[PDB]
Write a protein that binds this ligand. Structure first.
Ligand SMILES: [Zn+2]
Lengths: 277, 172, 68, 287, 68
């Protein structure tokens, strides 16, 4: 048997948010938790929920699982509507990359022995600057796999080569002791709307005018800067036409900003004059 | 009967969770699980609500839920799965089933096997079966046999978590 | 085909072949889109007679690529 | 009391997930849970939640079994996980209140005297926030109308820590809206603002019609706020406002006109550059 | 196609020599399949059976379908 290079760990929206929150809720200590999910068949690992684990001093190791805690919370989740498995464990690496180091391989070996499909997800919450989420999923390579003359994981689809690995992980052996399974976040149509509500602008913000004093100051400043750019532009056009750009591009961006601001505020003003009387 | 690869889900049923609401004390739940002609009777009305629980999630291919052939047999079988709480004969009459079988005498007979929509039963821990109507119309309903045919889903049985490698002191 | 009719085996094969990005084994389906460029003469009783047709173009314009 | 309740995207997604994971296996309508968060002045910050088993009879409307033992154990576990978060109320995913709500709030007031019920509407509407927050108040009414234990609104908002913005941004990057004012987007924003104003005015009119015809009692607070709104309506026919409006409209349109002239000159310059490039190419090709 | 099977196996021999990965192994299996399509001549597979042993799992599928 082999693990295809199309396997994906579909991390749900709730799981991703919980992971990032727990990472920056305990940086620069490391944090750990379980990933309740579902092994669909052989190419899918669905991480439906994640599962914080109390900080226990011994970093993140096998002794940091606290069997009483996990058992009791799994029972309680079962009776509240989560009859889910334990597909792997996530554990943050606060700022020093997304890979594994020794104890991680030992712990993931424990999880695999429990069930040989459990992934291990690593999140770097400091490097997760807004606009880039650094999460990577991993699983081990059998000692009799790369030494017996077999590639770590077969390849039947062109899917597994659309993401390039990072040198940070290469150094620690992204391809000598463990894989890298793709993520492929799974978003419903309701979660996306509920999240859009985060920055959704109110009708008030749509229909509210801009402080006229500040608007006039902005008009004046932009028109002056545009005058300077226009003098430079005259000089540039004369010089280029004589001897045979930055002024033109800056002038274009500034004209854009002035026109958008003025038209928007003027139309808002008329709309209000009609709507509120 | 049993296509290769699928096995009867008797061994994975734990009595810790099995129950059957509205059952006559004369004929108990143990009757439906012997393959003998020992039956289960309805107590008050022409309705019944069985519930079976499995140790590890299982996949259900077919059901052998059959009764006698004297007009006292299940007619409308509503199957729900994975119920957080034991339900009542009032929710059983409106809740949308995961399956809505309407048995016929052919299925009722000893050689009748009713196949379910396999896809909706890919992870089953608890099954509640509501018999809403009898084959004809009898104040008491009777069930002669009931067993599921399917496959078990590989279990990640926590509490088995142990050090398979290394010392007992590494932290990170 | 050689008469303007859409060739169902060919279209189907090319589609399933393009679906190799997801499953390599399907790449074989392109075999369905291989029409032999042939002009086969048959005699009255559907037997194959020994004859030679003549082109009107340099052989190098339509000859096999040279054996490497 | 508490004026503001800022809910978090994790709370919202958790509620959605609870509703889905129970509705899939049954049909319960409501799903009920506890909210965990922290105070800062009179500004509640709901930053987590968890389901608590619930079951009620939709006929009797006074028989329900919110499970306080489960609540306590679950809160113990989350207290171990993170301690700067104490129970700050509850939530239920029902589009409207229910008779039980006051009794459930009385139950939860054991664990938080200042309880905030956030009715997180799973169904995605297109005009309002999905959270509406309430707090229980019993007090002798000033107008002498008989007093009963009923809810009072507490302003609600959605805000996020940076650790959650990094997630929401990534999840929504596919269908995101540029965080900059493109003129089309701004005109769209104003149209949506008019949509919303119309919706709110229709709501007010429907309520006033119901009040007038008598199907509802009169709420002096609502009448106060409405007549204050009318009080605040402005006047536009006033001369020294029409003068000022014309003055600033003209100033804005001078800026617009200068912008347009600059754009025209730049466009002509680019056209000349391209015509010269093509002329050179044609001449070189000819020679 | 049998009669006019004027194929050059030297190109495939060079490709095989250049094969290192299993992607390329199955790629060359498919390439031989194409090159011989219609031609009931499996000489490239018949004269290299050591090389048709590094394909395991979902590559033996492709090799057998290639005979097809
Ligand atoms: Zn680690």
């Amino acid at each position: 048997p082999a693990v295809d290079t199309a396997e994906q760990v579909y991390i749900s929206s709730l799981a991703l948010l919980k992971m990032l929150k727990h990472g920056r809720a305990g940086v620069p200590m490391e944090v750990m938790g379980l990933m309740l999910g579902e092994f669909v068949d052989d190419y899918t690992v669905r991480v439906i929920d994640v599962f914080a684990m109390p900080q226990s001093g011994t970093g993140v190791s096998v002794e940091a699982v606290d069997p009483v805690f996990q058992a009791k919370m799994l029972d309680m989740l079962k009776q509240t509507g989560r009859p889910e498995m334990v597909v792997g464990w996530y554990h943050s690496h606060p700022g020093f990359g997304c890979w594994l180091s020794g104890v991680d391989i030992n712990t993931q070996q424990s999880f695999e022995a429990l069930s040989e499909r459990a992934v291990a997800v690593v999140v770097d919450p400091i490097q997760s600057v807004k606009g880039k989420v650094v999460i990577d999923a991993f699983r081990l390579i059998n000692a009799n796999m790369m030494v017996l003359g077999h590639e770590p994981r077969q390849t039947t689809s062109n899917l597994g080569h659309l993401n390039k690995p990072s040198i940070q992980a290469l150094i620690h052996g992204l391809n000598r002791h463990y894989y890298s399974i793709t993520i492929n976040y799974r978003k419903n149509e309701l979660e996306q709307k509920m999240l859009l509500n985060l920055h959704k602008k109110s009708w008030m913000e749509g229909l509210t005018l801009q402080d006229y004093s500040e608007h006039c100051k902005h008009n004046e400043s932009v028109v002056k800067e545009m005058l300077e750019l226009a003098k430079n532009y005259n000089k540039a056009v004369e010089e280029e036409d004589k001897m045979t750009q930055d002024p033109k591009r800056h002038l274009e961006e500034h004209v854009d900003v002035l026109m958008t601001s003025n038209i928007v505020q003027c139309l808002a003003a008329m709309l209000d004059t009609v709507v509120f009387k | 009967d049993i296509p290769k690869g699928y096995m009867d889900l008797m061994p994975f049923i734990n009595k810790a969770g099995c129950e059957c609401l509205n059952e006559s004390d004369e004929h108990g739940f143990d009757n439906c699980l012997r393959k003998d002609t020992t039956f289960l009777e309805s107590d008050c009305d022409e309705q019944l609500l069985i519930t079976v629980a499995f140790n590890q999630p299982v996949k259900l291919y077919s059901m052998k839920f059959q009764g006698p052939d004297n007009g006292q047999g299940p007619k409308y079988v509503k199957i729900f799965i994975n119920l957080p709480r034991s339900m009542d004969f009032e929710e059983a009459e409106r809740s949308e089933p995961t399956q809505a079988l309407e048995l016929t005498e052919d299925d009722i007979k000893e050689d009748g096997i009713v196949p379910l929509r396999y896809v909706k039963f890919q992870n089953v821990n608890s099954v509640t079966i509501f018999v809403q109507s009898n084959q004809g119309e009898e104040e008491t309903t009777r069930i002669s046999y009931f067993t599921f045919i399917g496959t078990p889903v590989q279990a990640t049985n926590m509490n088995d978590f142990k050090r398979v490698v290394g010392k007992k002191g590494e932290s990170h | 085909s050689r008469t303007g009719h859409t060739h169902m085996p060919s279209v189907v094969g090319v589609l399933v072949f393009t679906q190799f990005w997801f499953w390599f084994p399907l790449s074989h389906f392109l075999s369905l889109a291989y029409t032999p460029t042939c002009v086969i003469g048959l005699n009255k009783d559907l037997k194959m007679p020994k004859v030679q047709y003549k082109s009107n173009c340099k052989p190098s314009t339509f000859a096999y690529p040279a054996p490497l | 009391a508490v004026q503001k309740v800022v809910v978090h995207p994790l709370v919202l997604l958790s509620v959605v997930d609870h509703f889905n994971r129970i509705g899939k296996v049954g049909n319960q309508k409501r799903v009920v849970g506890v909210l965990l968060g922290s105070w800062q002045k009179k500004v509640l910050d709901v930053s987590n939640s968890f389901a608590v088993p619930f079951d009620e009879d939709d006929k009797d409307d006074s028989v329900w079994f919110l499970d306080h033992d489960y609540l306590e154990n679950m809160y113990g576990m989350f207290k171990k996980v993170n301690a700067r978060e104490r129970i700050v109320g509850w939530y239920h995913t029902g589009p409207k209140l229910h008779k039980n709500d006051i009794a459930i709030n009385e139950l939860m007031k054991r664990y938080c005297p200042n309880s905030v019920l956030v009715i997180i509407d799973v169904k995605p509407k297109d005009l309002g926030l999905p959270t509406e927050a309430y707090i229980s108040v019993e007090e002798v009414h000033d107008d002498g109308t008989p007093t009963s234990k009923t809810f009072e609104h507490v302003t609600s908002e959605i805000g996020a820590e940076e650790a959650e913005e990094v997630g929401v941004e990534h999840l929504l990057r596919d269908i995101k809206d540029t965080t900059v004012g493109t003129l089309s987007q701004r005109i769209t924003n104003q149209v949506h603002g008019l949509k919303g104003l119309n919706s709110k005015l229709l709501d007010i009119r429907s309520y006033l019609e119901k009040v007038a015809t008598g199907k509802l009692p009169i709420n002096h607070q609502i009448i106060y706020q409405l007549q204050d709104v009318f009080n605040l309506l402005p006047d536009v026919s006033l001369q020294e406002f029409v003068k000022a409006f014309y003055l600033k409209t003209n100033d804005q349109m001078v800026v617009v006109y200068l912008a347009s002239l600059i754009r025209s000159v730049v466009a002509l310059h680019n056209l000349i550059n391209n015509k010269i490039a093509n002329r050179d190419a044609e001449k070189k090709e000819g020679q | 196609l049998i009669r006019n099977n004027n194929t050059d196996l030297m190109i495939l021999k060079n490709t095989k020599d250049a094969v290192r990965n299993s992607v390329c192994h199955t790629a060359t299996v498919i390439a031989n399949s194409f090159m011989h399509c219609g031609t009931t001549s499996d000489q490239f597979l018949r004269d290299n059976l050591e090389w048709l042993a590094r394909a395991t799992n979902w590559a033996k599928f492709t090799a057998t379908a290639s005979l097809g």
